[PDB]
Nucleic acid binder design. Structure first.
Lengths: 128, 117, 194
RNA sequence: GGAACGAGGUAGAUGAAGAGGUCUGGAAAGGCCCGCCAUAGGAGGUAACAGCCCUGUAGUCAAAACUUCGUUCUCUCCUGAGUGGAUCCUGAGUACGGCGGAACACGUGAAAUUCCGUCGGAAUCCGGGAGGACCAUCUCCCAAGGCUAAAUACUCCCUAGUGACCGAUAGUGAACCAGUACCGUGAGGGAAAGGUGAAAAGCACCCCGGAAGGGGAGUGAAAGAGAUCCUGAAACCGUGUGCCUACAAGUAGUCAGAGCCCGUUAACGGGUGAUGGCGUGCCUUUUGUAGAAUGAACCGGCGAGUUACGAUCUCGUGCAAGGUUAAGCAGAAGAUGCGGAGCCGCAGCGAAAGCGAGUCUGAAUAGGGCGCAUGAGUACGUGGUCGUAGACCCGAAACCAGGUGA
RNA sequence: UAUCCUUGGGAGUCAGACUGCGAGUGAUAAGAUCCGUAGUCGAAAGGGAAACAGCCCAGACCGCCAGCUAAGGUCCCAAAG
RNA sequence: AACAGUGGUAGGAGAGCGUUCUAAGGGCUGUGAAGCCAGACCGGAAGGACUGGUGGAGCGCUUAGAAGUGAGAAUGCCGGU
RNA sequence: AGGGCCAUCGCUCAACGGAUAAAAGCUACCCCGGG
């Protein structure tokens, strides 16, 4: 690329609509604003309370183990390194949405009941 | 950056005050008043031109209506008789130019008179 | 990736996945603006209706203040504010642009590889004669991997030239000069960062 | 407690290479044609645009005297560790009790906590306090004595330097003998005003006149450059001269149109126009204007949708079930590296416990609510609105605090 | 004949006026008021009603010294018996 | 290429011209730049050129980019008449 | 302890889509935006 001919991308730039400069462009005199220019949420009652300590573990579609090399020593500190989980919080929960493939050692805080059998069917271990 | 922009208002205000050259009085030196007259000048020119097309047709009638009145025929018995007797789409302004002569203009009246009877 | 080798008086193969990429010239337009905006400084501070050493008394149309902006001294309701004109690209977009500007000059027979660029002293006469041998009439670039003081001090006066290290090449350096001399040892180190 | 040693600061010294040739010019720094130095083509001057014309810059070296930092001697002062386990202390109107207040994001409440007064009042290693009223359990920690640098905040100033800053209605109120001239008893308010030329070479003399101010002559490249003086616009005031004008009712124009008078970015030209037709100024505001509804004496300058931080939306770009770093450090106040703390997404429902491709509701495996099933975000950039900030400009009466005046 | 639904972005408007139909208030008084249907004006010039925001006729992209018609008209001002 | 269309305020969308500065190249200028004054030229508009006179040292083109961005109206302000 | 979640009470809020728990005239020589 040379520095003379810097053609931008089409539609990547736009000129500013400058408001109030002359009647020909539109927005001429009144500047696009025209001449002389209980709510609902204060009728809906509040909803119980909130818990001071909710424990939300990291959940991963059963389908996250379908893209891994071999079901062995699948510890959460390897889930967090490769980054299938973006952040370890309280615990790592496994969900039973999806189909499994081979056997893979799983180490999780909790387990769904439908998620428990699908690793127990492929040949994996569920160590909590 | 600050943009002064004093040099672009000289050239724009001159181009109005050239178009107002020849007007009476203070209406050809003052920008506040000449700009009110170049506007009403262009607006009057649009109407003048449109009225000029319907005027000259008003002129060509009153010469045909006199040149035919030498032979007893009025304009009505002429125009109406020239659209049935024969095929002569002679234009109002085109026929008025040939109305000056006795002979060429009367040659149509005689033909229309024969078709009128 | 088949540029020839030069050596003062007197062909190699570079990473084709670095120096032989098809360019993406949209990524070279926005990348230049991000490197040019930072250059500017933005130190223009104008005065306002409240920062003028002026009155607050209604003097006598209405005109409740003397230094209101429709008067003769003291205006600029909005004016230029000293801000920051430097935004950030995502990292791969910064990485893609340096590959695109280098690969473009491979095609145009513009890059020239040297072997280690050894000088005798910091003389400009010896450096000026070296430029004639390589026929670089307008601006150039000299990229050296170890920041030799000799070459750097011998090419700081000639107007079109500009010396710099290999860990500090960026977009407006290479896009501005249209000829560039690299030491062959520096060709490795640009591949390692990207 | 003192002297050495080194680095600076406050004054400076040194410093490379063309009268190149020729043209035009009042004058070469320009053109044309030829060289040179460069750790030095950053600047500023010079009769017009200098790399080699000066003053300078890079570089290396310098301060007797003052200081500002460090390095070093001298000087100055100087016990630590066990082991026991018999008695003492370990910081009192104090910790806490009541009343009344006040401050913590918290408005006296469910409410610790802190600090005031006001009244009472302890305990002291087997001891004491805390862990959001309170009580047991349990972990951490010793109150009521005092000291302490660094990393941080802002600058009237002082050198060195920058601008996608302004260039005389701007920029500070002030480029000029400016907080001055003036206004006010006073507190206070508060302007206007830049440019001869490369130099004074700033008009000897002669003429008119009382002098001003002229007309010649001289200087000068230019006197149309002669002291408020570069350039010199428009309003306004005039003097010449082509064509109309003393029976004519007119938002003053436009279209038709002779007649005379001129020759042009040569073109279906230019300037006037006797006479005929049509024709209720401009902006604002209103159901609506010619209005007697509002505004402008005219000319010239100045004079109104901005920027931060958020929110959302479209387009472009990068990567994509994964994208992205912040502060900070190394870097010409720059790009770029490096930083994986954090954020958004990848699956929800429920008040929550919770369970989960479903889950709440309910005797319910019913019905229904929501949700997948049918899945694309994210980071930057432009742009469109909405927020919060004086928020688009201009425009009150009053209010409070601190002051000046019989 | 070619429109209208859905989501999404941006709005403006919220005392309308009079002319042709049956009322109400009023005195079937009012360029009065308030209704409802249609029109025009609002935001629409051109032709006609002597002049006329709303009535009758018709919708202006711009040129032309072209033609045919609409309402209304044809002694003269003023085109046409 | 044939058919259809083009009144218009609030308001929505799209395409453009100018001004100062900055970056890249390319190039006018003392044999006369900006500015100022005329003129019967060119473009659908905002606007561009070209000769002539004054002027006596700077300016412009192409592609981009940033805005203190474009005046006839404020019982606007300052100057001049 | 206290709150959530269901059953249930207290409103003439009567200026009934409910400005706060709480609230009168007054004065013109009147201050001021408007006919």
């Amino acid at each position: 690329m040379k520095l003379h001919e810097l053609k931008p991308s089409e539609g990547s730039r736009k000129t500013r609509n400058r408001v109030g400069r002359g009647i020909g462009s539109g927005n001429g005199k009144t500047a696009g604003k025209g001449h002389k220019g209980m709510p609902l949420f204060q009728r809906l009652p509040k909803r119980g309370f909130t818990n001071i300590n909710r424990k939300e573990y990291a959940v991963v579609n059963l389908d996250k183990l379908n893209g891994f090399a071999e079901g062995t020593e699948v510890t959460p500190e390897l889930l967090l390194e490769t980054g299938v989980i973006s952040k370890l919080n309280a615990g790592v929960k496994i969900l039973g949405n999806g189909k499994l493939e081979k056997k893979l050692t799983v180490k999780a805080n909790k387990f769904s009941a439908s998620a428990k059998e699908a690793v127990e069917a492929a040949g994996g271990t569920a160590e909590v | 950056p600050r943009v002064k922009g004093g040099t672009v208002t000289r050239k724009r205000r001159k181009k109005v005050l050239k178009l107002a050259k020849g007007y009476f009085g203070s209406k050809h030196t003052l920008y506040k008043v000449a700009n009110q007259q170049v506007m009403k000048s262009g607006n009057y020119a649009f109407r003048d031109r449109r009225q000029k097309k319907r005027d000259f047709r008003k002129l060509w009638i009153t010469r045909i209506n006199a040149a035919a009145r030498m032979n007893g025929l009025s304009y009505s018995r002429l125009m109406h008789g020239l659209k049935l007797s024969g095929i002569e789409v002679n234009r109002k302004m085109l026929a008025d130019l040939a109305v000056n002569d006795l002979t060429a203009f009367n040659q149509l009246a005689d033909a229309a008179k024969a078709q009128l009877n | 990736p088949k540029v020839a080798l030069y050596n003062q008086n007197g062909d190699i193969e570079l990473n084709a996945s670095v120096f032989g990429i098809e360019p993406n010239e949209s990524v070279v337009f926005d990348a230049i603006l991000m490197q040019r905006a930072s250059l500017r400084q933005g130190t223009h501070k104008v005065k306002n209706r409240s920062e003028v050493r002026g009155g607050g008394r209604k003097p006598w149309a209405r005109q409740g203040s003397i230094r209101s902006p429709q008067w003769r001294g003291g205006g600029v309701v909005f004016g230029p504010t000293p801000r920051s004109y430097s935004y950030k690209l995502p990292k791969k977009v910064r990485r893609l642009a340096i590959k695109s500007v280098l690969s473009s000059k491979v095609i145009d027979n513009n890059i020239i590889v040297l072997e280690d660029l050894t000088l005798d002293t910091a003389k400009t006469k010896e450096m000026a004669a070296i430029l004639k041998g390589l026929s670089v009439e307008k601006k150039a670039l000299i990229v050296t991997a170890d920041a030799n003081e000799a070459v750097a001090l011998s090419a700081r006066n000639i107007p079109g030239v500009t010396v710099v290290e290999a860990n500090g090449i960026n977009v407006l350096d290479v896009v501005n000069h249209e000829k560039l001399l690299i030491t062959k040892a520096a060709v490795e180190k640009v591949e390692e960062v990207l």
